[PDB]
Amino acid sequence: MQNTTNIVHVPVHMGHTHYFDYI
Amino acid sequence: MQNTTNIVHVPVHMGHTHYFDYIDSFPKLKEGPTLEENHITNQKILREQLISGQQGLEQNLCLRNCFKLSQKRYIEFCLDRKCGGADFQRAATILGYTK
Amino acid sequence: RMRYLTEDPAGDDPLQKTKDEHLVDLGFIPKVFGANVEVRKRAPHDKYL
Amino acid sequence: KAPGQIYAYDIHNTHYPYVNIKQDSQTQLLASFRRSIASINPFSYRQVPSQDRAAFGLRWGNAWYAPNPYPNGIHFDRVFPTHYDPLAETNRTKANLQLIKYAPGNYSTLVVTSEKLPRPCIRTIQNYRRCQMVNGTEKCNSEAQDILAICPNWALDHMKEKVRFYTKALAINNQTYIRAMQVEEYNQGRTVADVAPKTWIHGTRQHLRPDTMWADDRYTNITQTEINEAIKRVEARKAREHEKKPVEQANVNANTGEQPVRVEKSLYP
Amino acid sequence: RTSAHYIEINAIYGAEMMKRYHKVWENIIEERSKATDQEKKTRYAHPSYQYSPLPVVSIPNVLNPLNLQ
Amino acid sequence: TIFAETWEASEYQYRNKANLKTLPVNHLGKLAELKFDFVEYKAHQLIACHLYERMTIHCMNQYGLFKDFYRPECLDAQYYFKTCVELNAAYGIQKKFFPEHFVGSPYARPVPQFQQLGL
Amino acid sequence: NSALIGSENQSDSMNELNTNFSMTYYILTVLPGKFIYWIYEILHTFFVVC
Amino acid sequence: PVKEGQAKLWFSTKEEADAYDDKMISNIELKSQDYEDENFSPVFNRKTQEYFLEPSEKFKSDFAELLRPLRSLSFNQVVDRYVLIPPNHTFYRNWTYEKFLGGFGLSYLILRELPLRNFYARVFVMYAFAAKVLDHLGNPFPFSGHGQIVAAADRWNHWDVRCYDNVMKALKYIRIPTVQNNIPE
Amino acid sequence: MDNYFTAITLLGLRDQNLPPFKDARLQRYKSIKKMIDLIETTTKLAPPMPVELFMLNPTDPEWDDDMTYPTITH
Amino acid sequence: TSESVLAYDYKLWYLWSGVSNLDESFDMFFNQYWALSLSTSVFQLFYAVILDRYLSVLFQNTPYTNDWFRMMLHSKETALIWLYHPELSWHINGLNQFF
Amino acid sequence: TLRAGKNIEGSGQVHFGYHDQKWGMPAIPMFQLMYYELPGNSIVVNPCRNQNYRLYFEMRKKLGI
Amino acid sequence: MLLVKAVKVLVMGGCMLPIAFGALGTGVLFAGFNVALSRNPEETESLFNNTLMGFALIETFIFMSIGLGFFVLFA
Amino acid sequence: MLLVKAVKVLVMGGCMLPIAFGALGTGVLFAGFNVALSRNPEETESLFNNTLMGFALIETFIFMSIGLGFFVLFA
Amino acid sequence: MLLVKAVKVLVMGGCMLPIAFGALGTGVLFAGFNVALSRNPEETESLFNNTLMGFALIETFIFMSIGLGFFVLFA
Amino acid sequence: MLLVKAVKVLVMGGCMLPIAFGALGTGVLFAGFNVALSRNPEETESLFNNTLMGFALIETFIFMSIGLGFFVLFA
Amino acid sequence: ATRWYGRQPGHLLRADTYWIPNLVSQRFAKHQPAHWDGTQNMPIFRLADPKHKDSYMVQFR
Ligand SMILES: CCCCCCCCCCCCCCCCCC(=O)OC[C@H](COP(=O)([O-])OCC(O)COP(=O)([O-])OC[C@@H](COC(=O)CCCCCCCCCCCCCCCCC)OC(=O)CCCCCCCCCCCCCCCCC)OC(=O)CCCCCCCCCCCCCCCCC
Ligand SMILES: CCCCCCCCCCCCCCCCCC(=O)OC[C@H](COP(=O)([O-])OCC(O)COP(=O)([O-])OC[C@@H](COC(=O)CCCCCCCCCCCCCCCCC)OC(=O)CCCCCCCCCCCCCCCCC)OC(=O)CCCCCCCCCCCCCCCCC
Ligand SMILES: CCCCCCCCCCCCCCCCCC(=O)OC[C@H](COP(=O)([O-])OCC(O)COP(=O)([O-])OC[C@@H](COC(=O)CCCCCCCCCCCCCCCCC)OC(=O)CCCCCCCCCCCCCCCCC)OC(=O)CCCCCCCCCCCCCCCCC
Ligand SMILES: CCCCCCCCCCCCCCCCCC(=O)OC[C@H](COP(=O)([O-])OCC(O)COP(=O)([O-])OC[C@@H](COC(=O)CCCCCCCCCCCCCCCCC)OC(=O)CCCCCCCCCCCCCCCCC)OC(=O)CCCCCCCCCCCCCCCCC
Ligand SMILES: CCCCCCCC/C=C/CCCCCCCC(=O)OC[C@H](COP(=O)(O)OCCN)OC(=O)CCCCCCC/C=C/CCCCCCCC
């Protein structure tokens, strides 16, 4: 199973930016 | 957890030899009859079965094939249709399935 | 609060936990409970984050 | 002793249908020329398989054709997060080693399969059932112990879990039965006698008008005058229906530090 | 490995038995076409079922929707 | 069965197994690759697997099934439609008899009753 | 991996069916065009930065 | 005025029907193409007929053309024709691939003898010929990878290895790894 | 999304078009929820038929030969 | 293992695309009964249920339900029989459950 | 192993953790005399398979061939 | 829908812009040819040939526009 | 949405503007070439080559324009 | 968004205006190079290099516009 | 609100107008350089040094426009 | 339990001269007093998490 797998219980919005991945 | 881990239920004896790891023996291993002895022993069974065990066989084969079916209701149908109106318990006693 | 509510899947190995097949042979028959589907996870006060 | 031909050979009647998916003039003209000389052309390749000769698939120019893999958002980054969206491009771009790795099974579906239990374990199960229907359950202890001993433990676990699954599916099917056989308030006291002599076609567009204004020529002769009058009648009925309105309920998801309820989303933002 | 005999013999067995099922399937549809709505809704039905006639409607008896033999 | 046009992706991802496939929404970009003229209503493009079905019809009407339907824009629609209904049939079954496998289900990681805590 | 010698990255598209919808004769038509654009990006850069 | 047709409504009483017509008529927005009209719209003129997707004649004619050899046959003839093909495993089925791919080598024999005078002009020809091959072979280096050929699917695919079970699992099944990351027991 | 063709057929998409507004279009989806539970239950009432009809029992000792496919290495 | 290896090889791909009428991967039943359900008919809803049961059969890729072992109504050979006897989906779903 | 249902973190056989390694036969005569690599061509189908041809010889005689 | 059609026909009218510039460019070219001929009339044939050639290139743009015009007008 | 498509085809018409300036620029180029030839006819071949070369640079803008047009028309 | 996007793509069409003026500036430049070459052919190579050199300043504005075009088209 | 935004971007397109005239002004400046060079090449350095200087002032205004362009787009 | 405790993000200083945008922007920033609210976890700086909106430029490996 994927090592970078997380289950979150509250909503989050991710940035749709190039070269970056964040909330 | 070690990847090369195995749980064995029968005794094994491992050889304590340098550079090698293997099972050199099995405790209380009995050498049975040779392949030639079993061959001769089997030929005596096949010879008798060939001379005295070929009469009335066509009926027994139909009974055996009927009992290889999935459901019981299909067996009774096979017996009545193919085996000439045979009985379930009476055929099971011939085949040796009854206690 | 999000990382407090960020859990990982599957928890821990159930085989490292007490078995129900063993409690029976020990003298205690466990009672089977249902899943609690009405509870909502929430974060504590900020002082405990 | 003629070779066997597949059903596809009787649709085309030839083994050399030069099907190329590339819709360029150079390709379709060459295929028409190659499609005509395939009988006496040494550079001919089959595309319809047979019992005596295998065949090739669909051609893409000089290369071969395969459909675009069904969109799959699963990907694996190497250098930087790419945010791969399978819906942003028509054809999936090739996977560069330093950029992305796509999920396995470019052409794969989801199925359910089962392992085949060992043959000796199967024979012990056959002997138990056979002795069961013949001699009864109470006289099958020896055949039951042979199962627990000869069948490896991984098989007994499978057998143990099959019973729990089918027990689960049995309930899931009976719950649907209960919801299906429930009598609603709009069908209380109604039986087969109160059913109409109608079939599926009677609920179609020819017999049952859809809930749209331009499905047929029903409202094609309506004028602006008739509309203004109709707006007055609907407003008249609203003088008696608008008297009631549901009360506003509390927001169960008011606290942001609480696991929100997956409540039905609003029709509009 | 699974016996190659079974794989090939069963492939022929299944087809030789389907040609015989097609003929049996036709005789059953024919005998059922000459059956009353009451008989075809109570025969092979559950004992606890009470038959209640339904309104008669026109539903053709077509063997194969596709015009096949 | 899905009784809406939109579904939460996380509800169709596994919680205790590796996620190798998603259940994506219809690929509206494939609709612009049809070279011929056609009429499509926006009210039918979101429901699962139906867009690829209507496109296959449009392509089977403009072209046929022989030597003209065999173009990339039309075969990908037929393959998508056939693949969409197979995946959705399996996911729907897996949701019916294996709801504990998916995220959002309270049985994937059951929360215990207070009687099991010993307080 | 089609440019690697004795690749061991069997999970990176080596054991998968990988077709495309580009022009064929890839190394004669497509791959040169990528190098042509490469030469433009770098010549436009040199002329600009210089 | 309201027009009647073959398509009828789904209301028992006439008041509910009139209420439905009044609801739909109150939502009509007429768009006329003629000037001097209170409801005039040069662009954005709404159509007054709804389009319905149906299978055309070209659609239904080609699906019936696929079944032409089946209408002339009986079920027993169809099985004996396309299903019960007499087993004959003596043919060299893979000759189709040998001829096609072997033609590259035979073609190189004739192509390496081109009377082109300039050595660098034949460099271009062989570069184009290698491109034709590399569309199938993929990697030019040896002991690196495999070629890629899409072949037709028939009942004789893997016909001589159907008896082996592990070959089926490796080709067909892509198993999903679990949290307890292990091969099935 | 199982029972696709059944649901698409009940919604009428084979003869008509859905309403262009979300309010009514969504209510039409929830209207078939009962019928799907019904048609699925009906499909689970099929009576049994002999398995040994179009399929030989693979567990029969006749198939213990584990025979291979003889080929010709052309 | 260590065996003979070749410098250059070709790997075939018997793709089951389902969109090619040139080979046996063409699902004739699905495409015929699907187009049959598009035209207004009294069995329009019945054909839909049939197609849904056919998809639940492909979903069961067991040793007793698969093309590898040439099982009836699962292999490429018997794909046409679906056109004559689509009622056998229930028999298949039950048979696979029995074994 | 990946296709069989086991995801793989990292790569290689130089196990960082609690596992046994096997480095490869040292290319010196000492190990080249004790060990030799597994020849795949020596793994064979059991010849008992050929005993199923007895069924064919008996059928040919039953049918009068 | 109907709007984009009005834009297409409008663009089709735009093609008359090069038709205007081509007219002026022709007058300019022949204006130079007249003067150029007076400067060195001994080679009238050379100037004359080069003159018409330029005009051919001028109208080339015209056909490209008209062609492109009908393209967007029907594609 | 629909209007975005309309402005796209509208822009595609704008590409006919360089087509117009390219015509005038060509006429001017050949206008000077004529007078230039009369000044020094001894090098007619050199002037001629330079004439067409410059024109090639003009058509570059042309292909560049229509290229941008067809791109924005479809992207 | 879609409304502003419509004028965005329209602005991108404006970038084809320098594409027009750049063509005319080219036709004019090579014209001066030709006439100037005739007056003093002794320094042909010098003039020739300066000609193309000047042209480089034309495509300067071209790429700058297209760059600014796609930029505002997305920024 | 959304309208003024659509105008803000629209103005930003107008900034490409000097980008067009700057190209034309260059071809004219370089044309005079060639003729001026062919006239008296002995004084190239002086004639040349003044050429680039003028061009520097030319594109300076071009950059200046882009400044005001982004200003009105964000101010 | 160990994985859960590890996701509780640590405190990472906002001061950064390695990212040129912060090297410029922070020269104009005004340092205001952070009045203690009675806790030991006041996130008056950025957080040591890759998904934080002020730490996404940092490479956590
Ligand atoms: C009594 C009469 C008896 C005779 C009568 C009959 C005579 C024969 C009639 C012919 C019948 C039809 C032939 C069918 C059989 C073809 C078999 C075959 O192998 O074809 C494969 C070949 C490749 O197709 P394919 O592999 O099946 O792939 C399918 C799709 O292409 C795949 O789609 P895709 O889009 O993915 O593919 C991309 C596309 C890319 O798009 C392109 O096609 C590229 C086009 C760009 C170049 C176009 C210009 C070519 C000509 C320029 C010369 C002009 C000179 C004059 C200029 C005057 C200006 C006004 O295609 C390619 O990339 C192809 C690349 C391979 C070719 C390039 C390398 C070739 C080497 C050339 C060196 C020549 C040196 C001399 C050697 C001679 C001996 C070998 O097919 C062809 O290319 C057909 C060629 C047809 C000829 C066209 C006209 C050529 C004119 C040349 C004039 C110069 C010579 C003068 C001779 C004068 C003689 C009098
Ligand atoms: C950088 C400098 C250089 C650039 C210069 C040029 C820039 C050009 C780019 C455009 C600039 C932005 C302006 C766009 C306006 C929108 C136009 C449009 O889409 O048409 C729809 C528009 C309305 O459609 P409709 O048929 O009335 O709809 C009836 C339905 O019942 C309606 O019911 P429904 O239920 O079907 O609803 C449909 C839905 C559809 O929704 C949409 O599609 C959205 C439409 C986009 C606009 C929506 C936002 C509007 C916000 C209001 C603020 C407007 C500010 C304008 C600022 C102007 C800048 C100076 O809602 C609408 O109907 C939207 C109504 C659109 C009204 C547009 C605002 C009217 C402007 C009032 C001033 C008129 C000045 C005319 C001067 C003409 C001089 C030649 O059609 C017309 O207006 C027809 C033209 C006007 C009638 C007189 C005939 C004039 C013929 C002129 C021929 C020459 C054309 C130009 C040649 C140029 C080269 C020589
Ligand atoms: C009395 C004097 C004579 C007067 C008569 C003169 C007229 C003669 C012609 C008419 C009679 C011909 C007889 C045969 C019927 C063929 C009819 C036909 O349409 O063929 C078209 C034929 C096949 O069309 P295709 O379907 O497009 O297949 C070619 C594709 O490339 C295939 O693409 P693919 O990807 O689908 O397949 C790849 C391909 C591999 O294909 C390739 O690798 C070639 C790719 C092209 C090269 C790559 C660069 C791309 C070049 C593109 C530009 C080429 C333009 C050429 C235009 C030519 C226009 C016709 O591998 C294979 O698929 C299997 C091939 C191997 C199968 C077995 C072949 C057996 C041949 C038997 C030879 C017997 C003769 C002896 C030979 C000489 C002995 C010393 O196309 C050709 O023109 C092939 C040219 C090969 C060169 C032949 C050189 C020897 C010719 C001998 C002539 C007679 C003896 C002369 C003695 C000298 C004193 C006289
Ligand atoms: C500090 C600077 C120095 C650093 C240098 C760089 C370091 C190295 C970098 C390495 C880079 C990575 C290497 C590539 C990665 C992939 C490796 C791989 O997968 O290989 C697996 C592959 C598996 O084989 P294996 O694991 O070693 O053995 C298992 C099996 O036995 C194998 O299969 P089998 O069991 O079926 O084979 C049975 C055997 C059957 O043999 C027999 O039964 C008896 C022997 C009969 C020999 C007949 C020869 C055939 C022709 C005879 C015709 C004339 C007849 C004369 C009279 C005959 C008398 C009977 O057949 C043979 O193998 C014959 C081999 C013949 C070799 C020639 C004999 C002399 C030994 C070689 C000396 C030269 C190399 C040393 C270089 C030293 C330089 C310092 O390895 C190879 O055997 C192939 C070797 C070549 C691999 C490298 C290819 C690299 C690609 C680029 C080069 C392409 C070649 C272009 C040459 C151009 C020359 C101008
Ligand atoms: C002078 C003759 C010299 C020959 C070489 C000397 C040594 C001879 C060794 C003989 C060994 C014979 C052992 C048997 C080998 C079996 C070969 C084989 O299986 O081929 C089968 C198969 C038959 O097809 P099926 O119908 O599917 O199979 C039916 C089986 N009854 O044959 C083939 O594969 C077809 C290809 C045959 C070989 C290649 C043919 C081309 C030969 C190239 C040279 C000819 C050039 C001129 C060709 C003219 C072209 C216009």
mmCIF file with all atom_site columns, C-alpha atoms in Angstrom, chain B residues 12 23-24 29 37 39 53 62 68 70 78 88-89:
data_model
loop_
_atom_site.group_PDB
_atom_site.id
_atom_site.type_symbol
_atom_site.label_atom_id
_atom_site.label_alt_id
_atom_site.label_comp_id
_atom_site.label_asym_id
_atom_site.label_entity_id
_atom_site.label_seq_id
_atom_site.pdbx_PDB_ins_code
_atom_site.Cartn_x
_atom_site.Cartn_y
_atom_site.Cartn_z
_atom_site.occupancy
_atom_site.B_iso_or_equiv
_atom_site.pdbx_formal_charge
_atom_site.auth_seq_id
_atom_site.auth_comp_id
_atom_site.auth_asym_id
_atom_site.auth_atom_id
_atom_site.pdbx_PDB_model_num
ATOM 1  C CA . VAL B 1 12 ? 13.834  -32.464 9.486   1.00 0.00 ? 12 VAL B CA 1
ATOM 2  C CA . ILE B 1 23 ? 18.129  -31.310 4.659   1.00 0.00 ? 23 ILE B CA 1
ATOM 3  C CA . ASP B 1 24 ? 20.405  -34.353 4.735   1.00 0.00 ? 24 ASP B CA 1
ATOM 4  C CA . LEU B 1 29 ? 12.683  -42.707 7.440   1.00 0.00 ? 29 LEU B CA 1
ATOM 5  C CA . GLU B 1 37 ? 8.832   -54.933 -6.234  1.00 0.00 ? 37 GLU B CA 1
ATOM 6  C CA . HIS B 1 39 ? 5.645   -53.271 -10.114 1.00 0.00 ? 39 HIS B CA 1
ATOM 7  C CA . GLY B 1 53 ? -12.869 -58.718 -12.626 1.00 0.00 ? 53 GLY B CA 1
ATOM 8  C CA . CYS B 1 62 ? -22.910 -46.801 -14.689 1.00 0.00 ? 62 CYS B CA 1
ATOM 9  C CA . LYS B 1 68 ? -20.315 -38.606 -9.411  1.00 0.00 ? 68 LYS B CA 1
ATOM 10 C CA . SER B 1 70 ? -23.703 -33.006 -7.927  1.00 0.00 ? 70 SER B CA 1
ATOM 11 C CA . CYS B 1 78 ? -29.322 -41.361 -13.482 1.00 0.00 ? 78 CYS B CA 1
ATOM 12 C CA . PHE B 1 88 ? -29.856 -45.321 -4.126  1.00 0.00 ? 88 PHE B CA 1
ATOM 13 C CA . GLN B 1 89 ? -29.096 -47.253 -0.939  1.00 0.00 ? 89 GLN B CA 1
#
